[PDB]
């Protein structure tokens, strides 16, 4: 019983974190094989006006890099631009490189953040990609290059490298191809995140988890069809429900159908009435069906 936002174990990623310093800038990189990936703004000499990164890379002084894993310093062999990232060839292979892939995550999907400072992991926590391609993270200035990851069957799937903060607690990264999530720019110029919508299919997973955990005071006796719900959602900051049959195993083990929870969502949208659901006072969309299944049944 219980439900917690948790992370997968971090040990396999921790040995890939390096410190990347250039000039007055210091952040983290990801050392896989004989390459270090880090945000390209480590070579930026400014913080206020639009940066010509190609110029910056042209005048780059390779020996002015300090890349270290613990107290082991890595020699830089060459540097190339990879979108919003620098791909740095170093002179040593990371012999603890895990089996890994890259994958760009989609809104609604969960992953793990290994928060890093000075090239060392400091904390690990689960996040969920919001509709406006930001995450609700906890990062301060030294944290760029912190990786996001999932672990599937001993393979590490890297999906995120931390880049910037947009608003209070509002964080943006790039995938490992160097494509910034949401199209935000790694420039110090005015940018605002777009409106966010609660991911409804995650809200459903949260409510099914609440049922499995015995929390039922909010369950509607009434029901509402997906369409009637989908028209209400676009006026009330929630995404539309497209398909319901991934909740079949949830419906089968609680006896409660989606349409009944859709009605609870409506009445819970702006009112828990002073009660709680699994400790929560507002609806949350940070749990996916997949996470719930694993925590309720393994």
């Amino acid at each position: 019983a219980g439900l917690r936002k948790m992370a997968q174990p971090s040990g396999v990623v921790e040995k890939c974190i390096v410190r990347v310093c250039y000039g007055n800038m210091a952040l983290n990189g990801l050392w896989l094989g004989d390459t270090v990936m880090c945000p390209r703004h480590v070579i930026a000499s400014s913080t206020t006006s639009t940066i010509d990164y190609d110029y910056a890379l042209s005048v780059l002084r390779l020996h002015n890099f300090s890349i270290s894993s613990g107290n082991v310093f890595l020699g830089v062999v060459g540097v190339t631009m990879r979108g919003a990232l620098l791909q740095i060839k170093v002179n040593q292979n990371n012999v603890h490189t895990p089996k890994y892939t890259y994958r760009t995550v989609r809104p609604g999907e969960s992953f793990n953040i290994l928060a890093c400072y000075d090239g060392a992991a400091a904390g690990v926590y689960g996040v969920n990609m919001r509709s406006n391609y930001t995450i609700r993270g906890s990062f301060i200035n030294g944290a760029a290059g912190s990786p996001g990851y999932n672990i599937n069957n001993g393979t590490v799937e890297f999906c995120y490298l931390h880049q910037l903060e947009l608003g209070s607690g509002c964080h943006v990264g790039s995938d490992l191809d160097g494509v910034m999530y949401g199209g935000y720019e790694d420039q110090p110029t005015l940018q605002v995140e777009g409106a966010s919508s609660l991911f409804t299919e995650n809200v459903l997973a949260f409510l099914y988890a609440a049922l499995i955990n015995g929390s039922t005071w909010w369950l509607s006796s009434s029901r509402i069809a997906v369409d009637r719900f989908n028209e209400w959602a676009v006026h009330n900051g929630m995404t539309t429900v497209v398909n319901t049959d991934c909740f079949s195993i949830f419906a089968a083990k609680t006896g409660v159908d989606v349409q009944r929870l859709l009605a609870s969502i409506q009445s819970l949208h702006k009112n828990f009435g002073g009660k709680q659901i699994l400790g929560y006072t507002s609806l949350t969309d940070e749990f996916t069906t997949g996470e719930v299944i694993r925590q309720m049944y393994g």
Partner: peptide
């Protein structure tokens, strides 16, 4: 705002 971290 964009704060490069």
């Amino acid at each position: 705002y964009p704060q490069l971290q």
